[PDB]
Amino acid sequence: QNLLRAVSNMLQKARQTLEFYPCSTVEACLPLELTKNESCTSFITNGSSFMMALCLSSIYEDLKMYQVEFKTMNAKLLMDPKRQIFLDQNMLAVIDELMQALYKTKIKLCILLHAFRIRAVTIDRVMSYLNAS
Amino acid sequence: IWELKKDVYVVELDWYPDAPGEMVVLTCDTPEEDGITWTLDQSSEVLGSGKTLTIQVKEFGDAGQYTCSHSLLLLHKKEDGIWSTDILKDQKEPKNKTFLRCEAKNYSGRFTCWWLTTISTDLTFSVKSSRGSSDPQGVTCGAATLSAEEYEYSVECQEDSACPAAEESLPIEVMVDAVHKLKYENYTSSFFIRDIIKPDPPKNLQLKPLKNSRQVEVSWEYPDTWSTPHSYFSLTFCVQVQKDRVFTDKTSATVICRSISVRAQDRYYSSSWSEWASVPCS
Ligand SMILES: *[C@@H]1O[C@H](CO)[C@@H](O[C@@H]2O[C@H](CO)[C@@H](O[C@@H]3O[C@H](CO)[C@@H](O)[C@H](O)[C@@H]3O)[C@H](O)[C@H]2NC(C)=O)[C@H](O)[C@H]1NC(C)=O
């Protein structure tokens, strides 16, 4: 739960500052209840089985993809004496923590901060559904 | 020169006085050849004759219900490079040049859009929508309407085969056709449902004061229209008494009395808070 907050603060911070930056996990972890709806055959349930590990495995793969992306970027980015900044180091730390528990270039970065926010959100939703009760 | 709806056309014109008009040609759709007459509606003057009337458009008077088949001409103004936005009011507020405003009550795929005009006379409005452009996806919209009086119109749409859990990555586009008299404008709005959410208010608050305490236990429940499962579609709630607020994602909180209100917010995207829900502190 010290994790959940780390994830949630990164999301709040992405949410607050992403404007100042220009420019299948969803199903594998689909909630049982959303199954009753035509347009959404695995699922997970309020309790948090092979489906379960599929979901988690999927989340974990997603994170590995992003972890590489962020480290590569951060390596390039280090040449900008403005050193690095922070949302990406935030996202990265959360990625690392989650994994354990389980100009041209400045544009490529904008694009990514965005793509991951959308995805940490999903991860955060399944994680929150899995506590619930 | 193009076709809007059935038997209606739009003529795009640089509104500059010195700019060329369009040499327009109205083929009378009625294969009868014969010596044929040509008029502009209530206009008695047989403006032309034959079969294929032909004319110079450049002014509104040059626009109208021509008659021989039917043929309506509406004009699209263009000034200094930009199309006219006369018929509607720039609600400014959101981002300037914001004519169409939308809102969603949840991730259902359903949403309302509304706009403003100063007009009251002839005013027709068309409305279409889809998700994506280079390979659109279906959205079904209802019909434009007087909602309140500046006069306000709104419409309702529903994304078609919509999974509330779907990550959005191509925005929804709403297209609006406006025709005030003989003038033709058209508006456009692009958004992701997650950005336009405004949820209904917290449902049924409750106090549950405790002995040895001026401190109360306030509670409520998710509004009926919100998305389920709730733990997946989290709302964050602000709990106020009247700073002294309390932010939580739980459906209760502990305050101190002396009223008590609660509003909701998507947990992740749209910041639009829900209308307050209150209760008397005593
Ligand atoms: C909103 O207003 C704009 C500007 O008036 C509309 O753009 C214009 O759309 C028409 C219809 O697509 C284009 O007309 C011509 O259609 C023929 C088809 O027979 C096509 O082959 C030609 O290439 C030509 O596009 C017109 O060119 C276009 N304006 C321009 C020149 O950019 C727009 O369609 C309106 N939105 C709608 C459809 O509600």
Short-list A11, A54, A8, CA closest to A30: A54
Q: Give distance in angstroms: CA of B186 to centre of ligand 1.
A: 11
- C-alpha distances out from residue B119 to A93, B44, B92, Å: 56, 29, 18
The three-class DSSP label of residue A41 is coil
Instruction: Name the closest residue on chain B to residue A47, using Cα atoms.
Output: B231
CA distance A85 to B97: 33
Tell me if the bond preceding B229 is cis, omega within 30° of 0: yes
CB-based contact B229 A124, cutoff 8 Å: no
3-state secondary structure of A116: helix
How far from the centroid of its chain's Cα atoms is residue B37's Cα?
A: 42
Q: What is the CATH number that goes with domain A1-133?
A: 1.20.1250.10
Token representation of residue B75: 């004009």
Q: Which residues contact B26 (CB under 8 A, 6 or more apart)?
A: B38, B52, B53, B54, B55, B66, B68, B71
Which distant-in-sequence residues (6+ apart) come within 8 Å of A84 by Cβ?
A74, A77, A78
Q: What share of chain B is helix, strand, coil (3-state, %, to 5)?
A: 0, 45, 50
Cβ–Cβ under 8 Å, residues B123 and B117 = yes
What would you report as the CA-atom Rg of chain B, rounded to the nearest whole angstrom? 27
Quote the CA–CA distance of B206 and B260 in Å, as a whole number.
10
Supply φ then ψ for residue B200, to 5 degrees. Answer: -60, 170
| Method for structure elucidation | X-ray
Report which secondary-structure segment, H or E, holds B49: strand B48-49
Determine phi and psi for A6, rounding to 5 degrees.
Answer: -60, -45
Provide residues with CB under 6 Å of ligand 1.
B 2, 12, 76, 175, 177, 186
Q: How far apart are the first and last CA of chain A?
A: 15
Q: Which two tokens stand for residue A67?
A: 């972890």
CATH architecture of B96-196: Sandwich (2.60)
Question: How do the domains of chain A map onto residue ranges?
Answer: 1-133
Residues before each break in chain B (C–N > 2.5 Å)? 68, 149, 242, 258
DSSP B75-96: EEEEETTEE---SS----TTTS
Determine contact, residues B53/B8, Cβ cutoff 8 Å. Answer: no
Atom of ligand 1 nearest to the CA of B175: 39
Asked whether the beta carbons of residue B233 and residue A119 sit closer than 8 angstroms, the reply is no
User: What is the CATH code of the structural domain delimited by B1-77?
Assistant: 2.60.40.10
Which H or E element spans position B32? none
Main-chain dihedrals φ then ψ at residue B36, nearest 5 degrees: -115, 140
Residue B174 identity (one-letter amino acid)? V
| Dist. CA B133–CA B127, nearest whole Å | 16
Distance, C-alpha A116 to centroid of its chain: 5
Interchain proximity A119–B162, CB inside 8 Å: no
Query: Backbone breaks in chain A (C–N > 2.5 Å) follow which residues?
Result: 23, 40, 48, 102
The amino acid present at B163, given as its one-letter code, is C
Q: What is the CA(B2)–ligand 1 centre distance, in A?
A: 7
User: Locate tokens 């499962």: which residue?
Assistant: B229
Q: What are phi and psi of A114, to 5 degrees?
A: -70, -50
Measured distance CA(B199)–CA(A90) in Å, rounded = 29
B165–A40 CB contact, under 8 Å: yes
B28 alpha carbon – ligand 1 mean position (Å): 23
Distance separating alpha carbons of residues A108 and A90, to the nearest angstrom? 17
The residues with which B176 forms a beta bridge, in sequence order, are B127, B187
Buried/exposed code over B204-218 (b: 16+ C-beta within 10 A; e: otherwise): ebeeeeeeeeeebeb
Mutate to test the interface with B, among A58, A128, A130, A133 (most CBs of B within 10 A): A128
In the sheet that holds B203-206, the strands lie side by side as: B203-206, B215-221, B252-256
Please name the residues in contact with B59: beta carbons below 8 A apart, sequence gap of 6 or more: B21
Q: DSSP secondary-structure letter at B164?
A: T
Q: How many helices (H) and strands (E) does chain A have?
A: 5, 0
One-letter amino acid identity for B203?
Answer: K
The span from the CA of B213 to the CA of B86, in Å, is 60
Interface probe, candidates B228, B231, B248, B266, chain A, greatest A C-beta count within 10 A: B231
The DSSP secondary-structure symbol of B151 reads E
- Residue B244: count other Cβ atoms within 10 Å of its Cβ: 10
Resolution at which this structure was determined, Å: 2.8
Q: Which one-letter DSSP state was computed for residue A32?
A: G
Contact A121/B268, CB-based, under 8 Å? yes
Four-residue CA torsion sign, B1, B3, B8, B10: negative
* β-pairing verdict for B139-141 and B82-83: unpaired
DSSP for B215-262, please give it: EEEEEEE--TTS-SSTTTS-EEEEEEE---EEEESSSEEEEE---EEE
Are domains B1-77 and B200-278 of this chain identical in fold? yes
Q: Determine the Cα–Cα distance for residues A116 and A100; give it in Å rounded to an integer.
A: 18
State both tokens at B10: 């739009």
Q: What are phi and psi of B86, to 5 degrees?
A: -80, -55
Phi, psi torsion values for B111, nearest 5 degrees: -160, 155
CA B169 to ligand 1 center in whole angstroms: 27
Closest CA to B166 of B205, B206, B137: B137
CA atoms B82, B88, B91, B94: torsion sign: negative
What is the spatial distance between Cα B116 and Cα A77, in angstroms, rounded to a whole number?
47
**Alpha-carbon span A114 to A20, nearest angstrom:** 12
- Chain B residues whose CB is inside 8 A of the A34 CB are 163-165, 229, 232
3-state class (DSSP) for residue B16: coil
Task: Judge residue B184's burial from the number of C-beta atoms within 10 Å of its C-beta, 0-12 exposed, 13-18 middle, 19 or more buried.
Answer: buried
* Domain made up of B200-278: CATH architecture: Sandwich (2.60)
